[PDB]
Design a protein around this ligand. Structure first.
Ligand SMILES: CCCCCCCCCCCCCCCCCC(=O)OC[C@H](COP(=O)([O-])OCC(O)COP(=O)([O-])OC[C@@H](COC(=O)CCCCCCCCCCCCCCCCC)OC(=O)CCCCCCCCCCCCCCCCC)OC(=O)CCCCCCCCCCCCCCCCC
Ligand SMILES: CCCCCCCCCCCCCCCCC[C@@H](O)O[C@H](CO[C@H](O)CCCCCCCCCCCCCCC)COP(=O)(O)OCC[N+](C)(C)C
Ligand SMILES: CCCCCCCCCCCCCCCCC[C@@H](O)O[C@H](CO[C@H](O)CCCCCCCCCCCCCCC)COP(=O)(O)OCC[N+](C)(C)C
Ligand SMILES: CCCCCCCCCCCCCCCCC[C@@H](O)O[C@H](CO[C@H](O)CCCCCCCCCCCCCCC)COP(=O)(O)OCC[N+](C)(C)C
Ligand SMILES: CCCCCCCC/C=C\CCCCCCCC(=O)OC[C@H](COP(=O)(O)OCCN)OC(=O)CCCCCCC/C=C\CCCCCCCC
Ligand SMILES: CCCCCCCC/C=C\CCCCCCCC(=O)O[C@H](COC(=O)CCCCCCC/C=C/CCCCCCCC)COP(=O)(O)OCCN
Ligand SMILES: Nc1ncnc2c1ncn2[C@@H]1O[C@H](COP(=O)(O)OP(=O)(O)O)[C@@H](O)[C@H]1O
Lengths: 54, 459, 49, 98, 104, 55, 320, 347, 121
């Protein structure tokens, strides 16, 4: 009776990384909701110095 | 002729300022008044046009189309106000605005006096129709139907714009009168062949030609009832009007060019009339009927004889009225049973007698019964084609037989037999539906009473 | 009623209304005077009046 | 045209190609940009010296000034990239792929 | 939840004849319904249809077809009274036409 | 055979397929500036030896 | 002049209105603890502004008239139904959890706006920083799914990172048998259905995660049930704290300007709550959305802007 | 960022563009470009995150290489004629170098790669600035030297830009990349008519800027950066989505909307020449842009997508800061076709 | 291009002194009325976007919209007319000064010109 309106299954085809998913771009992920990627916990490497004995 | 253009632009704010429960009444009343006003354009001269101003003019080919448009708007208003009952007042006013804008663009289109303005309005008509189809359709295929409708049109119409600007750059003007008086023959050149194709293909797509006709079943089946009415009645005739206007420049190139289009039109006449025999969907059957009739109109325009043009004008008017009535009749059953399958609701003559006689008269006018204007136009085109070639009668003859066949098949399937047992929600026909059917059908008979009003300028 | 009283006043902001109407009136008067001056200047140049 | 002009123009083309080709470190690309500035400065100075145009003797100075502005801009960007990733490798700058 | 949405169920059709046994199928409010019926019938059947058809039937002959008949009668009478061919195959007088002097 | 298959295949389905293929080819880039500037170098070299030579 | 860049370039700074007694304070305790009365006493002794704990209809109190709206038009969830049927297949549990998180986010934004606009301090009865304990209690008891937890974590990650943690974290520790006894003595039929495992999960979450996490950036003052009544002791304990560990001492005028621009514009605050993640418990179909939204605009003072609604008494509309 | 510093940087960007426009000296135009880039880099990085740093770095590298090529072209022109004035560009090799430098500054294909990445990596305000204001100076310089411009190279790059913008836009779900690809296609439309009539170039520039300002301001009003986040807007701001749909139709180029006018004038100007095939290809290719505009309109206005429960709380709050001229830009972006002959005030 | 460089032209004038010898557009010019309509539409869109009664919310600001659009449109129309007048003036002068490029051909009547006839059949 009522007009057909999109459902979750319909809306999820516009929610991917790109339209037309392919073999190469299947493992792409959509960007974060706020455009802030998590900080890569880069291991800091200090300089280790022998101070002495000579 | 601003006395018709300005009242529609005034229909706009009157609708947008009417109170919530009076929009349909006001729109219907004033649209009927506007159609009464536009009826005065039928007093045509016999030698030249009615040149109102520098931008608008009217001859006896565009006056019946204008009257048809102004008359069709109130019918669409009556047909729409049933399935929009639960709709909010703002979007109801938006729907009425879409219809009013469509009428305004159509009214200016049939009277634009130079080719570029005609093109602009011709393509401006696409936006309200697309919004109507893709916003107020019911099923999930309306999106794809709108996409087909838009892109089929634009792909064929952009080369028309390029050709038009080229023609004006070469000749200096695009005003129809100057184009007619200063016309010159086209040479047999590849450049001229492609300019002919660019000028013709947009209107072929709009008719539609059998080949490029795919958008039509999708668009007419997925559209709401008013959208289907305006698509079948008026929007298909834009291509015929454009051909009858643009063809003067094209000759003598048309003689050796029209062969593929004539062959496509005749064989597709046969094919699309045969398709209606095996259609399980009613609206698709009516759409393919429209395709075959418009193929006949294409043949008439291509062979370019005075009888051809008179028959084409008569057939355009008659088909507009008949197809509108058939779509409304189908929509009544659809609102009854919420399905478009033909064999779902059967034996409706037992339960809806007056609606059954409306069905009978619509089917009779569809299969070109004399002395209706449908048969006047069809027979004039058939005589012109017989003069063109005596072998056309076979194809024409075959088409008449299949047309009567599927028309009576549709009538028998929907109306006769025994009513399906399970369906018990078939309520008696409302006064609105019966009035709508009467207002489609009475003009057809009144027009066959005085047939010179829709026979075109060649009369 | 409103929990807080909607900083856009419940009465018109008479200052903004004042200068808005003032600039509208000034623009209209300036346009009328410009049009009259243009008409007179054009008639003076072309030997009409 | 002299042959020194060929040599200067070939130096410019070599620096442009070196910039275009990327290996790993960003620093090397900035070196190529600064080399392109050096070649442009030398070419401008030679042309300006050869035909005695006196008032254009200042434009190589302005060219060097705006060269330094580009160099500072690139160094700031390299600082921020290295802070984000720990290396100035251009391979890391691929987030805008998707 | 074994579902996908918090969606309203599809409502059933509201029969207009239920609350209004004589409902005209125009509107749910009986007064507006009756007046919609009346305005449609009056401005469609009474005003546009009948009066418009009468106006169309009595339109003045701007197509100039009785005039053409009268002119044809006068020319036929004049030409037959003078032993004329009653129609000539040259639409224009050949004297005002300058053909090319030779095609050889 | 004609309407639902071949008339569909020739004009609209072919158009959609070709446009989708071209869109996939054009858009799907690795995101790396190394390849972009290699393309820039190729483009510059082509312009200098083609358009420029024919003055 | 509404606060913005123009009010910042000329004049207005906010470090000249911070008077060392601001001290955003949040009180945390297990269900049915004396945290509300302790917070009220603390607020009225310290001269701060007290924020009653954000419920389902908190946003209703700050918009239009303070009167709450219908549950169908705001919230679409009830706490009573969660106590009656916590495993109902309509998704009431996580819908209530997410609506409560959004309400707490809004209340935190309002408290921060008041603090940064007037300098006066605020006292909160919970925060977005401690709302996850109920999430974990629901998850461990099987009330909600893991996907709901992931959605909550995404929203909290993209939302809570933009604000400053409270200066002082006050915890009222009341053991599970005592809070059960208090619930039994309460009189509400619905609460009495809280299993002891639920309260144990809430307590476990608070002790294991909320207090250890808040220890690195806030002042944590734990108490007991008998220590809460004497609020003078708590107030004089707050007066002798050293707010030195959090991110507050590292805030300049530019950071405050950014945060003050963020705390107003509640639409920007609530932006990431409605991300297009389609969980069946919180996703609403097009028809129901349209119907409920149309019903919302039919409310007396909700059709137009807060100054242009004629049917609530707004005059001079045509001159605004 | 401090508001004073941000205002200073924006005015420095604008002053660099104005210096490019008002200068008769090649060195001063180069200085204007460099000042523009120098002040433009921080604005892209106003909101700090790794993506903004990436966008700033890529933009800086591309514009610096373009500046290199532009200065080299200037020096070669000086060598072959001791002229510092922006004129006919007496040397053809220098002219080719200058054309590629300015095209890569604009983002014309095959140099189009930087634009989608930079637009996606920055905010909507920086994207608005990048896609509207940063096109004026290169186009002004190209207009000033259009007599010596090579038709074969410029038209090739314009057709490539139209094709690539149309094709790349089809694959995009993010809104910023869609806007970038539409920008590339419009750039191609602008530069196709450049060797024939610069008035048509300026007209297309103004119409495109109006439409782009309207679209970015609508996307900022409704804080949407993806297709599905814009699918929610109808449940909070239906009028905004309707206006956006009309603006999208205008962007597509369908008459009687404002967007149709620039293409209509460009086609007429090209057919005043011989030039028949290329306008036909340009229109048939702009069909692709119309297609993905319609996809956006389907997702945002002509259908109703499922919403979330938390939208009820957004229903109670108003849009705090309203951007001025949004109403004016929408009207100028839709209902201006009848005023088409007023383009004569542009030459 | 074509009109960019012309003798005796002030750079940023927008309305040269020689433009005052042209008839000013009437205040009831249909293009000015369309500009006023554009202003009214801008005012209505402003009302609708800000969630105010579209037709009746702000009358002073709608009036300001309409008058601003009309005010700009008047000078826009003046400049449009001036540029078209310049185009026609220059074209006529160029035709007059180069007679050999625009020669008046001999007048032929349709009785003398032989047009080939293409039957329709
Ligand atoms: C060519 C000839 C002329 C044509 C020109 C073009 C058309 C006219 C100009 C267009 C611009 C003008 C107005 C634009 C802003 C209005 C926006 C609006 O929403 O209006 C609401 C408003 C009603 O709202 P309200 O009363 O405040 O309270 C209800 C709530 O606001 C309710 O609020 P809500 O939140 O519930 O609303 C939700 C709704 C709201 O959504 C909308 O309303 C759509 C907004 C329209 C988009 C406009 C974009 C820019 C215009 C481009 C037009 C294109 C034309 C070309 C053809 C292509 C068509 C697209 O959205 C939806 O429900 C989704 C539906 C999706 C449908 C998609 C189609 C939408 C686009 C179609 C546009 C076509 C033109 C429409 C013109 C009128 C529309 C109001 O409408 C009006 O009242 C204004 C109508 C006009 C007033 C004129 C009256 C003046 C005095 C009358 C007398 C005349 C002279 C007297 C002298 C005679 C002597 C006696
Ligand atoms: C799905 C429905 C689509 C719509 C269908 C529209 C059909 C359009 C076809 C147009 C028909 C005429 C076009 C060509 C005119 C002449 C035909 C051709 O045979 O030319 C011959 C010449 O022989 C060769 O055929 C020349 C043409 C060879 C190239 C055409 C092959 C195209 C293949 C068909 C593709 C299908 C069309 C649809 C494309 C999507 C005639 O010899 P000649 O008298 O000396 O030349 C006359 C023309 N002159 C005078 C201007 C020079
Ligand atoms: C339910 C009960 C049913 C059974 C009972 C029926 C009751 C009796 C009916 C039977 C009578 C049959 C009618 C007999 C014919 C008489 C009418 C005839 O004389 O009028 C015709 C005239 O017909 C009219 O022209 C009909 C007008 C056509 C309709 C106008 C259109 C109405 C607007 C609707 C919109 C249509 C849009 C479509 C595009 C036009 C004759 O044309 P004409 O000889 O010259 O005019 C004569 C007057 N002259 C001599 C001064 C010139
Ligand atoms: C959708 C339409 C977009 C319009 C864009 C904004 C509309 C308002 C424009 C703002 C008006 C102020 C601009 C200038 C006013 C005074 C400055 C004066 O000196 O300008 C002179 C003349 O003014 C401007 O040049 C013309 C501005 C007119 C803009 C309106 C035309 C819009 C195009 C047609 C679309 C219809 C729009 C209808 C109104 C909405 C410059 O002369 P010149 O130094 O020699 O030009 C150098 C550059 N040239 C030669 C290459 C052109
Ligand atoms: C030179 C190149 C010229 C380019 C010509 C362009 C013609 C204009 C039509 C463009 C249509 C492009 C359609 C497309 O690329 O996508 C295919 C599309 C992908 O679906 P999405 O909605 O994107 O994804 C949702 C599911 N996740 O598939 C479809 O569903 C197609 C539906 C609509 C197709 C309409 C095509 C109608 C074509 C009519 C003929 C005109 C063609 C133009 C040239 C004319 C022939 C000379
Ligand atoms: C629903 C889908 C329908 C799609 C149909 C679209 C194609 C319509 C037919 C061709 C349109 C393009 C015609 C170009 C515009 C005409 C202008 C013109 O004719 O002027 C000619 C120019 O003629 C041309 O240049 C034509 C070039 C054609 C290139 C475009 C290729 C389009 C595809 C060609 C084959 C397909 C066309 C038929 C398909 C029908 C649909 C199935 C003369 O110009 P000059 O250069 O000055 O020459 C004389 C002076 N020496
Ligand atoms: N995030 C939440 N999830 C579920 N229920 C909650 C949440 N937050 C608060 N509640 C409920 O709100 C009710 C009131 O909380 P509480 O402060 O302990 O009572 P009181 O106001 O009397 O001190 C309690 O029944 C509690 O369970």
């Amino acid at each position: 009776a009522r007009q057909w309106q999109p459902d979750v299954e319909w809306a999820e085809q516009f929610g991917g990384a790109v339209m037309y998913p392919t073999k190469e771009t299947a493992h792409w992920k959509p960007p974060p909701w706020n455009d802030v990627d998590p900080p890569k916990d880069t291991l800091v490497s200090n300089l280790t110095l022998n101070f002495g004995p000579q | 002729m601003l006395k018709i253009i300005i009242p529609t632009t005034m229909l706009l704010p009157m609708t947008w300022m009417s109170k919530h429960n009076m929009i349909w009444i006001n729109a219907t009343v004033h649209s009927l008044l506007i159609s009464l006003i536009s009826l005065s354009l039928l007093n045509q001269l016999g030698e030249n046009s009615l040149n109102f101003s520098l931008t608008f003019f009217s001859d006896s080919l565009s006056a019946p189309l204008l009257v048809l448009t102004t008359w069709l708007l109130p019918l669409m208003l009556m047909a729409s106000q049933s399935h929009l009952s639960k709709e909010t007042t703002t979007r109801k006013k938006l729907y009425i605005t879409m219809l009013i804008l469509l009428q305004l663009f159509l009214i200016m289109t049939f009277t634009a006096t130079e080719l570029i303005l005609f093109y602009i309005l011709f393509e401006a008509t696409l936006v309200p129709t697309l919004i109507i189809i893709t916003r107020w359709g019911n099923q999930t295929e309306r999106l794809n139907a709108g996409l087909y409708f838009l892109f089929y049109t634009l792909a064929g119409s952009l080369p028309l714009l390029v050709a038009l600007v080229y023609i004006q750059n070469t000749t200096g003007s695009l005003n129809f009168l100057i184009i007619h008086y200063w016309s010159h023959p086209l040479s047999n050149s590849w450049s001229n062949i492609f300019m002919w194709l660019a000028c013709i293909m947009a209107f072929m797509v709009k008719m539609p030609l059998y080949g490029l006709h795919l958008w039509l079943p999708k668009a007419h089946v997925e559209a709401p009832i008013a959208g289907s009415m305006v698509l079948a009645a008026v929007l298909l005739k834009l291509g015929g009007y454009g051909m009858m206007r643009i063809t003067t420049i094209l000759n003598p190139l048309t003689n050796y060019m029209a062969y593929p289009f004539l062959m496509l039109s005749m064989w597709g006449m046969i094919m699309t009339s045969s398709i209606c025999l095996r259609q399980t969907d009613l609206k698709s059957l009516i759409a393919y009927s429209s395709v075959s009739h418009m193929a006949l109109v294409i043949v008439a325009i291509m062979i370019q004889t005075p009888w051809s043009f008179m028959g084409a004008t008569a057939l355009m008017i008659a088909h507009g009225l008949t197809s509108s009535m058939l779509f409304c009749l189908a929509n009544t059953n659809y609102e009854r049973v919420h399905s478009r399958t033909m064999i779902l609701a059967r034996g409706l003559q037992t339960l809806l007698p007056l609606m059954a006689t409306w069905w009978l008269v619509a089917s009779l006018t569809n299969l070109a019964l004399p002395p209706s204007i449908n048969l006047i136009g069809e027979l004039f085109i058939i005589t012109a084609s017989f003069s063109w070639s005596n072998i056309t009668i076979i194809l024409m003859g075959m088409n008449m037989m299949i047309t009567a066949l599927y028309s009576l098949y549709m009538l028998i399937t929907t109306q006769r037999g025994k009513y399906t047992h399970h369906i018990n929600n078939i309520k008696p026909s409302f006064t609105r539906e019966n009035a709508l059917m009467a207002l489609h059908i009475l003009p057809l008979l009144l027009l066959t009473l005085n047939p010179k009003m829709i026979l075109g300028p060649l009369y | 009623k409103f929990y807080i009283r909607e900083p856009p006043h419940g009465s018109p902001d008479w200052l903004k209304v004042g200068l808005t109407l003032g600039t509208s009136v000034f623009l209209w008067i300036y346009l009328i005077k410009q049009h009259k001056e243009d008409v007179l200047e054009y008639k003076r140049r072309n030997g009409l009046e | 045209m002299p042959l020194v002009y060929m040599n200067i123009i070939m130096a410019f083309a070599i620096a442009l190609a070196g910039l275009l080709m990327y290996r790993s470190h960003l620093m090397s690309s900035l070196l190529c940009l600064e080399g392109m500035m050096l070649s442009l400065f030398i070419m401008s100075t030679l042309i300006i010296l050869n035909t005695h145009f006196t008032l254009a003797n200042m434009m190589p100075i302005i060219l060097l000034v705006f060269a330094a502005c580009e160099a500072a801009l690139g160094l700031s960007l390299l600082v921020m990239v290295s802070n984000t990733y720990g290396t100035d490798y251009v391979q890391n700058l691929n987030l805008l792929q998707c | 939840p074994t579902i996908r949405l918090q969606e309203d169920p599809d409502p059933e059709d509201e029969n207009l004849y239920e609350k209004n046994p004589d409902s005209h199928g125009y509107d749910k409010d009986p007064i507006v319904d009756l007046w919609n019926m009346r305005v449609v019938f009056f401005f469609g059947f009474s005003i546009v249809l009948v009066l418009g058809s009468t106006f169309v039937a009595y339109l003045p002959d701007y197509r100039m077809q009785e005039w053409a008949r009268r002119e044809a009668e006068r020319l036929v009478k004049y030409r037959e009274a003078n032993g004329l061919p009653l129609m000539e195959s040259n639409c224009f007088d050949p004297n005002k036409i300058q053909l090319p002097e030779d095609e050889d | 055979l004609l309407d639902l298959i071949w008339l569909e295949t020739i004009l609209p389905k072919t158009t959609s397929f070709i446009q989708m293929k071209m869109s996939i080819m054009v858009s799907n880039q690795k995101g790396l500036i190394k390849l972009y500037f290699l393309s820039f170098l190729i483009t510059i070299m082509i312009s200098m030896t083609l358009f420029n030579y024919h003055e | 002049l509404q606060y913005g860049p123009l009010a910042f370039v000329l004049g207005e700074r906010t470090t000249r209105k911070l008077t060392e007694t601001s001290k955003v304070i949040t009180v945390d305790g297990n269900i049915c603890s004396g945290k509300g009365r302790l917070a009220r006493e603390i607020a009225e002794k310290l001269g701060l502004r007290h924020f009653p704990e954000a419920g389902i209809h908190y946003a209703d109190s700050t918009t239009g008239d303070g009167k709450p709206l219908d549950v169908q038009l705001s919230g679409n969830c009830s706490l009573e139904k969660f106590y009656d049927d916590p495993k109902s297949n309509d998704g009431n549990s996580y819908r209530l959890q997410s609506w409560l998180y959004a309400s707490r986010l809004l209340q935190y934004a309002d408290a921060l706006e008041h603090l940064l606009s007037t300098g006066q301090g605020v006292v909160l009865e919970r925060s977005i920083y401690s709302d996850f304990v109920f999430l974990e209690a629901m998850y461990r008891q099987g009330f909600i799914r893991k996907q709901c937890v992931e959605h909550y974590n995404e929203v909290k990650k993209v939302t809570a990172c933009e604000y400053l943690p409270p200066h002082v974290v006050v915890y009222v520790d009341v053991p599970v048998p005592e809070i059960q006894s208090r619930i039994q003595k309460k009189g509400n039929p619905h609460e009495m259905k809280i299993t002891a495992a639920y309260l144990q999960d809430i307590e476990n979450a608070y002790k294991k995660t909320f207090l250890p996490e808040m220890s690195e950036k806030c002042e944590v003052l734990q108490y007991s049930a008998r220590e809460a009544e004497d609020a003078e002791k708590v107030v004089e304990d707050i007066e002798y704290l050293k707010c030195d560990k959090g991110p507050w001492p590292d805030q300049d005028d530019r950071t405050f300007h950014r945060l003050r621009m963020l705390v107003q514009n509640k639409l920007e605050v609530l932006n990431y709550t409605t991300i297009p993640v389609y969980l069946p418990e919180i996703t609403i179909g097009a028809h129901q959305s349209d119907r409920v939204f149309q019903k919302f605009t039919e409310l007396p003072g909700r059709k137009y802007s807060p100054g242009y609604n004629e049917d609530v008494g707004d005059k001079w509309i045509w001159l605004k | 960022m401090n508001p004073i510093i941000y205002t200073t940087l924006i005015m420095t960007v604008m002053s660099g563009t104005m210096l490019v426009m008002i200068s008769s000296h090649w060195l001063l135009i180069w200085i204007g470009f460099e000042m523009n880039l120098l002040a433009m880099i921080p604005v892209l990085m106003k909101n700090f995150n790794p993506r903004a740093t990436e966008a700033a770095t890529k933009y800086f590298l591309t514009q610096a290489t373009a500046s290199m090529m532009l200065m080299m072209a200037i020096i070669i022109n000086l060598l072959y004629s001791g002229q510092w004035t922006i004129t006919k560009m007496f040397n053809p090799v220098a002219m080719t170098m200058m054309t590629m430098a300015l095209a890569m500054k604009l983002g014309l294909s095959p140099f189009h790669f930087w634009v989608p990445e930079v637009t996606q990596g920055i905010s909507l305000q920086a994207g608005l600035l990048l896609l509207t204001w940063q096109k004026l100076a290169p186009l002004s310089v190209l207009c000033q030297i259009s007599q010596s411009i090579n038709p074969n190279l410029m038209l090739t790059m314009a057709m490539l830009s139209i094709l690539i913008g149309g094709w790349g836009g089809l694959n995009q779900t993010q809104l910023r990349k869609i806007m970038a690809y539409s920008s590339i296609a419009h750039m191609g439309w602008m530069t196709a008519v450049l060797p024939y009539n610069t008035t048509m170039t300026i007209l297309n520039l103004l119409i495109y800027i109006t439409m782009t300002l309207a679209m970015f301001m609508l996307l900022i009003h409704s804080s949407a950066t993806t297709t599905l986040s814009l699918s929610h807007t109808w449940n909070k701001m239906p009028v905004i989505t309707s206006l956006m749909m009309v603006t999208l139709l205008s962007m597509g180029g369908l008459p009687p909307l404002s967007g149709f006018m620039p293409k209509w004038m460009i086609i007429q100007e090209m057919t005043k020449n011989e030039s028949i095939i290329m306008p036909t290809l340009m229109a048939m290719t702009a069909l692709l842009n119309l297609y993905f505009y319609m996809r956006l309109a389907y997702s945002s206005s002509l259908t109703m997508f499922p919403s979330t429960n938390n939208m009820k709380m957004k229903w109670q709050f108003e849009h705090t800061k309203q951007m001025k001229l949004l109403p004016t830009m929408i009207v100028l972006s839709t209902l201006v076709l009848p005023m088409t002959p007023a383009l004569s005030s542009l030459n | 291009t074509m009109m960019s460089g012309r003798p005796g032209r002030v750079p940023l004038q927008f309305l040269p002194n020689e433009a005052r010898s042209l008839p000013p557009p009437k205040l009831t010019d249909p293009r000015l009325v369309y500009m006023g309509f554009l202003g009214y539409c801008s005012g209505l869109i402003d009302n609708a976007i800000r969630r105010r009664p579209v037709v009746s919310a702000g009358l002073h600001r709608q009036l300001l919209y309409v008058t601003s659009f009309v005010f700009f449109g008047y000078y826009l129309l003046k400049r449009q007319d001036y540029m078209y007048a310049l185009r026609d003036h220059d074209m006529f002068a160029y035709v007059k000064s180069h007679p050999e490029d625009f020669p008046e051909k001999d007048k032929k009547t349709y009785g003398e010109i032989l047009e080939e006839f293409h039957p329709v059949r």
